Ligand binder design. Structure first.
Ligand code: PRO
Ligand code: PRO
Ligand code: ZN
Ligand code: ZN
Lengths: 464, 464
């Protein structure tokens, strides 16, 4: 019995694919999950790519405390520790749901003058925002992520940092995850608490719902003032720094799953997939040697190409079982190398996106690289296609209600929080972002009729 | 205030070098510290080296929960969360002090047959073991580490795993940290709670005190039976699995500090140093372009050699500041590139171990690799020498008392926990380990006079 098809019950599909693809399981504590190897592998690949980009932009990792003094922030989202060291604590401690306060506290002492700027930090680690309904990679009390924090002398430098980091997320999304996104500003109601403004990249999942794939905020001098973070400038004048904050959690994995997955299971993007090419040898005692020798040789030839290949040499599972598992886990390509095919110097190259073809083993190494890129380009093409097919401009609240049932709704909004909150209360849909690049338009609020704001149509959609 | 020399007050020297090398700082919560970029970079290299070794030995990373059900274990060590989701928990959760239980729980349901073995897992993350007084990298409530957990079908396979890992640790210490260690067994009184036997690698710091650089435990089937972790063997019979456990925390960093640091600050082992060669460009307005062009050229030449080089062209600090900084931070080699020397195609290459010499930029790329290797060898050499000069066979408790005041004391012990405890109560010294490879000797306990156990002399010392 297969997975509950996407069109049947998308939600139940998602959970099942995660279990079957062995991406994760559920821990003994409600709301907490354990990321199994295969799943962790995806995370590690995302860490690596992001790290490079962070480093190339002059950022450095570090590590701040897990516990934060309540004074700095019981709110529901918080997991609070009231007892430690056997005794009850005078002031309870919050397990970090985010680290801006603690970092700010530390910057207050490290920063003295322009010589201590800019501060370009990043932290890979966990955080805790309490969750009851456990949904691997989408809803979990605890989750892993990357939270970058920076401090600058000028406002201009900070704002450039925000967009720089957002773009890095968009690039990871597009060039590495084959997930098309939309860059823009969150509305006042939707921004990060403490930030003057929040930028974001919004993606559209296969079930028509939007998902924020990453975020970068301009905190101005809000945290600087709160945590007394000032410096003496070259002009001998003492000023407040301007900080920024940017993060991307393993929710990005859920994005990968709900964007490219199908009724057969996962379909991982080549440039982030732990296994780009699995090799399943087909043989009998008589040809075991000659094939494994030809298989391993391929393995080595592929490695030499810099490809992430995996030789499923397991001598205890039918080639079908293997084939199924790798299909379930979304391995881009699969090479079935057997007796008869080998004899002509060829083998069969199965594509996860569908199709097969017997090619010459000697050509595989030179071919695969370019094929993987095609595979990636195709994933993106379809995703784009899907979005185009699920995006609609609306001028009436009746058309809007229809649109947010299928995907993205481009509506005019007055800009009033109460009006936007009403739209969510009635249709459950929210504002995703006020796109940076969008045809400039003026009109009237699709919900209250009053004159539109933002000078362009806002992206609306039901979101995760 | 300069660095309190080691001979004056080693402890104050340590706290001081850590602050001055900007390795870490104290967080807003007691017993908490923040690892600064430079310090974190050290940890990263350690992660990378250990990761490669773990992977080459078939281990895969995963990520289990931060929270552990209290019933799986308020002990002083624990940091308990009693409130979450805006209400008081009916069952207070414990912040993991170690991931033995949860992983066992998971294994209970993941393991069914011998097909599901061996289970070779590793996790990189944080744990919390409440601490009152805070001492960077040695005593902190929260600390980062790597904890390996494996499950095996046979007892032999488990024990081989145990030693395999300890050896990897030992290799890390020796070949990478240039820190000589001693592989042996912890006595019954000093083993890991829940383990059959605990192996370890003991190192001697420059203050004559011992320090555990890492441990590997044979848990037998204690956890397996406790969490009902069994499998159906090939012989159709159902049996318990045998599990191991091994860890190495950022305490290893503290080891690197107290093993090679001098009165001038840190001295980092080349193979683990974030920056192996730093290039500080000294120039004037009329010579900025020429100096920087050559400096960058050298940077690229060294990178090409696979060396970790850094070009310090910060505008927020002067040359004086920098040279002092990199000395404090312990960079193995320093390259002073100025206009005059550049005219003759030269620069000053200074060694952290002491030395200077104007050399032609063209020879540096080809010489440095070798020089670094020598640097490493030298560090190790001295470290070996230091230990030799601070290890002493003792046959009397009086001599014992003297030896433990300088370093290692090779004494005979009855093996009684009571006796061993008495020794510590009296001298504060502890058994570090009963070395695997040591000259076989029979005798009488240095403290109670009763016949000796372990068939060899037991390593004693005052430890961290
Ligand atoms: O939680 C957030 O959205 C910000 C950005 C990463 C760190 N904190
Ligand atoms: O704490 C210990 O010693 C074991 C080994 C690492 C995980 N737990
Ligand atoms: Zn309106
Ligand atoms: Zn005794």
């Amino acid at each position: 019995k297969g997975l509950t098809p996407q069109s049947q019950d998308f939600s139940e599909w998602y959970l099942e694919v995660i279990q079957k693809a062995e991406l994760a399981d559920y821990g003994p504590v409600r709301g907490t999950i354990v990321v199994r190897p295969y799943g962790y592998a995806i995370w590690e690949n995302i860490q690596q790519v992001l790290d490079r980009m962070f480093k190339e932009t002059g950022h450095q990792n570090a590590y701040f405390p897990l516990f934060i003094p309540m004074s700095f922030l019981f709110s529901p989202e918080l997991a609070v520790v009231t007892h430690a060291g056997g005794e009850e604590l005078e002031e309870p401690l919050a397990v970090r749901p985010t680290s801006e306060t603690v970092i700010g506290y530390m910057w207050s002492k490290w920063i003295r003058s322009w010589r201590d700027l800019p501060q370009l930090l990043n932290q890979w680690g966990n955080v805790v925002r309490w969750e009851m309904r456990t949904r691997p990679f989408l809803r979990t009390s605890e989750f892993l992520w990357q939270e970058g924090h920076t401090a600058h002398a000028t406002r201009e430098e900070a704002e450039e940092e925000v967009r720089r980091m957002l773009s890095i997320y968009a690039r990871l999304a597009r060039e590495y995850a084959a997930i098309p996104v939309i860059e823009g500003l969150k509305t006042e109601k939707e921004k990060f608490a403490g930030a003057v403004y929040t930028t974001t990249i919004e993606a559209l999942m296969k079930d028509g719902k939007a998902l924020q794939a990453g975020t970068s905020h301009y905190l101005g001098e809000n945290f600087a003032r709160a945590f007394d973070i000032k410096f003496q400038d070259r002009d001998l004048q003492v000023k407040y720094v301007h900080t920024t904050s940017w993060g991307l959690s393993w929710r990005f994995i859920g994005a990968i799953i709900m964007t490219h997955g199908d009724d057969r299971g996962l379909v991982l993007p080549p440039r982030l997939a732990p296994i780009q090419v699995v090799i399943v040898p087909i043989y009998k005692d008589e040809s075991r040697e000659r094939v494994l020798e030809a298989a391993q040789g391929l393995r080595q030839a592929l490695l030499a190409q810099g490809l992430r290949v995996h030789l499923d040499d397991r001598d205890q599972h039918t080639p079908g079982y293997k084939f199924h598992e790798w299909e379930l886990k979304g391995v881009p390509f699969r090479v079935e190398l057997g007796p008869k095919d080998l004899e002509g110097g060829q083998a069969v190259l199965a594509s996860r996106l569908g199709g097969k073809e017997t090619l010459p083993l000697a050509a595989l190494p030179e071919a695969l690289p370019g094929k993987l890129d095609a595979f990636h380009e195709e994933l993106y093409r379809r995703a784009l296609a899907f979005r185009e097919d699920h995006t609609r401009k609306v001028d009436t609240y009746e058309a809007f209600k229809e649109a947010v049932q299928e995907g993205f709704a481009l509506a005019f909004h007055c800009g009033d929080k109460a009006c936007e909150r009403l739209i969510q209360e009635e249709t459950t849909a929210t504002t995703r972002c006020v796109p940076f690049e969008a045809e400039p338009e003026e009109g009237f609020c699709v919900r209250c009729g009053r004159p539109s704001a933002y000078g362009k149509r806002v992206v609306f959609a039901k979101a995760y």
